[PDB]
Amino acid sequence: IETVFVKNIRMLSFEDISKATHLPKDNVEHLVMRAISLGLLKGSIDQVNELVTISWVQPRIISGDQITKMKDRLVEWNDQVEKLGKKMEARGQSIWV
Amino acid sequence: TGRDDTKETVYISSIALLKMLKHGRAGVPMEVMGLMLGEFVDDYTVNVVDVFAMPQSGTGVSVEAVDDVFQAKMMDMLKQTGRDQMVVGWYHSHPGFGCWLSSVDVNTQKSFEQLNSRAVAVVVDPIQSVKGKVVIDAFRLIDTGALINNLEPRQTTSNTGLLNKANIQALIHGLNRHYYSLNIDYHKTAKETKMLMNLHKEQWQSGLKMYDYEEKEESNLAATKSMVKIAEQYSKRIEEEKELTEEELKTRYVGRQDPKKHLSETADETLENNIVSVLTAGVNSVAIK
Amino acid sequence: MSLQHEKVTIAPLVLLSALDHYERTQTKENKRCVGVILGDANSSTIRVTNSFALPFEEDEKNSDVWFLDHNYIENMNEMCKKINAKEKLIGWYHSGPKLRASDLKINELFKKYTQNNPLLLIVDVKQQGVGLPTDAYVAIEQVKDDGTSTEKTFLHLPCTIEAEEAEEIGVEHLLRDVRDQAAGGLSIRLTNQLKSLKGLQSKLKDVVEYLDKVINKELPINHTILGKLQDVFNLLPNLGTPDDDEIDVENHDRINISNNLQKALTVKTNDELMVIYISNLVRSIIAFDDLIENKIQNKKIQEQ
Amino acid sequence: FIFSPASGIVDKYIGESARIIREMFAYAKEHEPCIIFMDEVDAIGGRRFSEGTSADREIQRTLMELLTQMDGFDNLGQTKIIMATNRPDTLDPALLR
Amino acid sequence: MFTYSQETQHGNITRGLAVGLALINYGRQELADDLITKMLASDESLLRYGGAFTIALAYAGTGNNSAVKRLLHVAVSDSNDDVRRAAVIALGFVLLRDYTTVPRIVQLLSKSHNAHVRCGTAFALGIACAGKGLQSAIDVLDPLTKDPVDFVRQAAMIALSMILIQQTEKLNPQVADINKNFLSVITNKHQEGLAKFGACVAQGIMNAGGRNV
Amino acid sequence: LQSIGQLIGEVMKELSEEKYIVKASSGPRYIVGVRNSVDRSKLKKGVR
Amino acid sequence: EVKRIQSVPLVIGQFLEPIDQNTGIVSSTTGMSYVVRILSTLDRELLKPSMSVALHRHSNALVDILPPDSDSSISVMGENEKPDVTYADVGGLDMQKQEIREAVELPLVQADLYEQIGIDPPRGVLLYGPPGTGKTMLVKAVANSTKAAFIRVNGSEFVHKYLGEGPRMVRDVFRLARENAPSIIFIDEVDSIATKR
Amino acid sequence: NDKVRFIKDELRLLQEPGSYVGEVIKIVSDKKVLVKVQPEGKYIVDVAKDINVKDLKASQRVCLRSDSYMLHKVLENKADPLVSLMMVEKVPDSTYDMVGG
């Protein structure tokens, strides 16, 4: 739940998960399944691409470190709209009636 | 004589018109009544600031259905907050008739005139305001003794000469020849124009609100299909229509009920929509992610 | 008591009215106005039908000192009960401009009269922002994860507006404006699209500088505010997925009907092209015969 | 149960005396099982007639309404007719059916 | 005068001071430019109503494109009927110097079917093309004389009698026909009073001065 | 006393989505609106 | 502005006939006949022959039109109901069976069979007899079998109940039949409706 | 402009008080017309300046402007009672090449 949340990616190879939790591939598959039953993560599993694509994360307590991570994500989208907005000012100049 | 001696142009406030309408509409079908509070300036400008309703009755509008207790008390409530002025007249509802005073009201208007001679009666139709246009008219009595003294031209001196009418025969005879009409204009500040003009906090943020694309597919599918059938209609029209006399040809070969006009209209309509739909999708995909 | 103030629909009459009361007590220089709101409750939508002023004098030394007449409120209510008897105390309006924490004490006083939970309707008289001039709040009681006991605090309510059939058509009669937030023709929606986008840009920028203010300028940390931003990131769209490939495909289909319709109008307009040119040929014949006739017309004017 | 006397379902207004008896079969399908006792019917028992008075085509309008009910694309049901008469050879033979 | 228009609350005064502003800023042009900008921008009808005639009198007899360009904008784009009128009427004051081109400017404005605009198209032409007649001017006014709306009729009859001032049917027959049209209305009692007012005043404009002016 | 009456119809026929043909118990058919109180699926022919 | 007069509430009249393309005669179902203006840029192809139509409430004017499908006396009783008797309740009644399959079934399967031989088609079917003979039974038998659109009306569904109700109910049943043509209209009894005297 | 001022003018034109169909029973020579309104009863009512009693006749449908029932136009219709009988019975006509032999 920690690894998906903190990352801006939301697909992880089982290799990364295997190394972290010191589990075999048989047990990553159970662990992922349990998260889904209890409702602590929801998602779907490709054991043919070898990913776990999580699609929802349970909100939890947000501590000092996480706010900084949350914050940066927001600066990127704020700047992205502003850049994008100049072109849309530029184009279709004739009419703004 | 020595004054303008003409009926005021009632300037009804932004607050007031809505309030008479809400108060008349709840009581439809039964007749409604109430006081107009306002101030008198000029000789012919009354600005009606606010309204209050005098409670219902079981015999509806009467002189009798005036109660001094309700009128005076309600008045002392507004006094404590200093939003009271002076009674400049009164409103009441005929929803079963057109604009014109009924036989009862003219006698109620005579009492009211007595108290204050600038007293107006405004007849509100809450049932003909189910249109885009609100039906509302103002009248004030000209006395029977007044008609004898032929003082009717006095009241229409120094005006644009533009008056209002309501139906013919009975209604019209009462209007012009026993009472006097003056137009009604609407008064407002730039503070109130902003208060009305606004809407929600995501109405100014509703072009990012794309639609479900099932519905947009529906819009795509219908417009193309329908145009096949009006196009067919367009082919028949121009096979003939080329002898002499334009109207005749248009009556003969379906040139009235014009498909040429109608085919263009549909096309243009579905065309302006789909430019924005493409615009919307291209913005939301790139902007957010 | 309850929470049942999920939506607050507010009549346009009330707003108009509130500005009118505010000026006729002439409360300026940071003076406030309180009146009762009358209307329906025990509905998820709280309907604000009507308002009336209460005399209230608010101090300038403190914000904790005020005069309000309890005796006044009932008299006002019983007269209005005679008009329409679906009107009961559902809160009181503040004239803003902004929320106060001395309004909490006033809320508790209106809780006596009510049989619902008091609506505090900050009706701004300053008309600030291009969106609503109303934010709405209800005083609700909570404990919180911090170690905070029995808190009285005001939770924002989304504001909407509805109007009756009679009331709405009143607006339309008064005004005739076309608006800058309307979604009407091609031009108008082009304007809305740019405006809507820039709308979002403004709100997001605030959030970024608000985050800074927690973590260096010691504004309070609150799980409601953080929790909301997490949701944004989790349900964020993604491109380059098979969702995106499909969006392009949908996009071609909409480009496709625009292309077919563009060609269709070319045929109707070129029909018109020819026909102007046919009329010119006929008007030529008419013009030539005309000249013989004009000779006699020129002549008559010389002769007499 | 109802019920209907022979002559309290007869009305002055026409298409009002059709109205009750149509709507009384309707009632019978909600409140089912039902028994419909016509009591001492000889009133609209009458034959084709209508070389007499206008009364006899009033009889005729109301009689035609019963036949479409009894057997038609309107079908019954758990509704039952008990018809009590004091002489049955008054009747129209489409009410002997 | 600018300040006092806000303070008053009698309808006659609000109008009067809007006109009086226009009057005192005759001949001022560029001098009066700050005042024109302010009066047009006010959301009330009455200050705009004088507001138009401040251009007219300020740019009187000048051949400035900009003076004329402003007045055209007010006319179409302002959603108040009273506002539209005051702007059409004004054009004639500016274009006193060259009255030849004016029927082409207003051809458009006479085509349109708003009562207040047409009523003022008629006047604009009357003020401008006075002196000796103009054939194109006469022609435009001719739908406007025969108008359904009584106020458009009142204005129009007056306007032609300025154009064709003291002219005879021994010079121009079209003047006899136009006069004879005025006499029919004075006879007729089945029209409104509004048509009758304009008929009397306009027939006396022709024959003014004891037949000498 | 402050409550007004209501006039009965029945759903004669669906016209569109939001427009309905009722036959009022006045007798003449009207075309009417919907509140959000009712649903499309709670209306059906022969319901008063 | 012009859409607001196209909107609710509306009262339903019935259009009789034109006198013009922008003025028509309609009979309101309030039992008042009106000569009324017609709005331009409505279609008039279905309007000029009698059809249901929307008239504004207060003013009374032809401001919009309705399709003929909707504003039916009673809907199709043949797609929203299904016959309740088949030809398994038939055995005998074969004499009428040779004449009913000519009369009803042959113009539904194809009308043009008649046309090309150069026989013009028979009209209406009257079935007579004691009603115990299974007349009614035969109609339901071939209707389940052909499985075309069918209408269940009766004269107690065309009957007068207020002024000008009863002629309106007559016009509507045929209008419906033609729109989804071909169609079989069944009126179970015309005993009341028609009388020799 | 022709277009937009045709819409704005049709909003006025559509607004009526109700304008009926009457039929003339008979005239009276006081300059009035006895009109039986087709739903309602009979009212003797004056006429407009576009018509008079000699442009009006029995069994000819008139338009009425109804707030006094003041005759507007002759209608573009006329009823004939003999065709009522003849149609309702229903019979064609023939030639002698449809009888022959």
Ligand SMILES: Nc1ncnc2c1ncn2[C@@H]1O[C@H](COP(=O)(O)OP(=O)(O)OP(=O)(O)O)[C@@H](O)[C@H]1O
């Ligand atoms: N040929 C037959 N085979 C089977 N059952 C039959 C037969 N003829 C008639 N019946 C049954 O007799 C009954 C009467 O027939 P049906 O429903 O056709 O009415 P009908 O004679 O037209 O009566 P009315 O028109 O007076 O209502 C039905 O239940 C029908 O099934």
Ligand SMILES: Nc1ncnc2c1ncn2[C@@H]1O[C@H](COP(=O)(O)OP(=O)(O)O)[C@@H](O)[C@H]1O
């Ligand atoms: N002289 C004839 N020529 C052609 N067909 C005829 C002739 N006479 C009879 N018919 C046919 O026979 C039908 C029956 O004759 P009809 O005129 O109805 O008879 P009636 O003599 O009883 O008045 C006619 O409609 C027509 O089809």
Ligand SMILES: [Mg+2]
């Ligand atoms: Mg049967």
